[PDB]
């Protein structure tokens, strides 16, 4: 218990950190752009095409 | 002939009077614009609902 708490105070914090840093905005841009290529990936196929 | 009053009038001159040209010209484009667009949507979405 103690251990998860330390590792995962790291875990948690790093995780929270990640979320935030990524919602920096540009990155959010990556989110629309990378998505879209992935949309292409999401929409390469017909079946996949429903995005 | 549409004027058709007999037969020719020798030197009636008209302005190439404008305005309509421009207006009708926006017309030419959009019936154009849209059509292209709708057509295209039917093309890939693609999939029943749109067409």
Curated annotation (Swiss-Prot), chain B:
Compartments in which it is found: Virion
Subunit structure: Homodimer. Associates with the polymerase complex.
Lineage of the species this protein comes from: Viruses, Riboviria, Orthornavirae, Duplornaviricota, Vidaverviricetes
Species the sequence originates in: Pseudomonas phage phi6 (Bacteriophage phi-6)
Record's function text: P1 is the major inner capsid (core) protein of the polyhedral procapsid, which is responsible for genomic replication and transcription. Forms a dodecahedral shell from 60 asymmetric dimers. Binds to RNA and may be involved in genomic packaging.
Gene name as annotated: P1
Name under which the protein is recorded: Major inner protein P1
Residues of the full protein shown: 610 to 660 of 769
């Amino acid at each position: 218990l103690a251990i998860d708490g330390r590792r995962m105070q790291n875990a948690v914090t790093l995780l929270r950190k990640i979320e935030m840093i990524g919602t920096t905005g540009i990155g959010a841009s990556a989110v629309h752009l990378a998505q879209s290529r992935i949309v292409d990936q999401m929409a390469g196929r017909g079946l996949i095409d429903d995005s | 002939e549409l004027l058709g009053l007999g037969q020719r009038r020798e030197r009636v001159r008209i302005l190439k009077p404008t305005v309509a040209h421009a207006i009708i010209q926006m017309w030419y484009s959009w019936f154009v614009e849209d059509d292209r667009t709708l057509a295209a949507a039917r093309r890939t979405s693609r999939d029943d609902a749109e067409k």
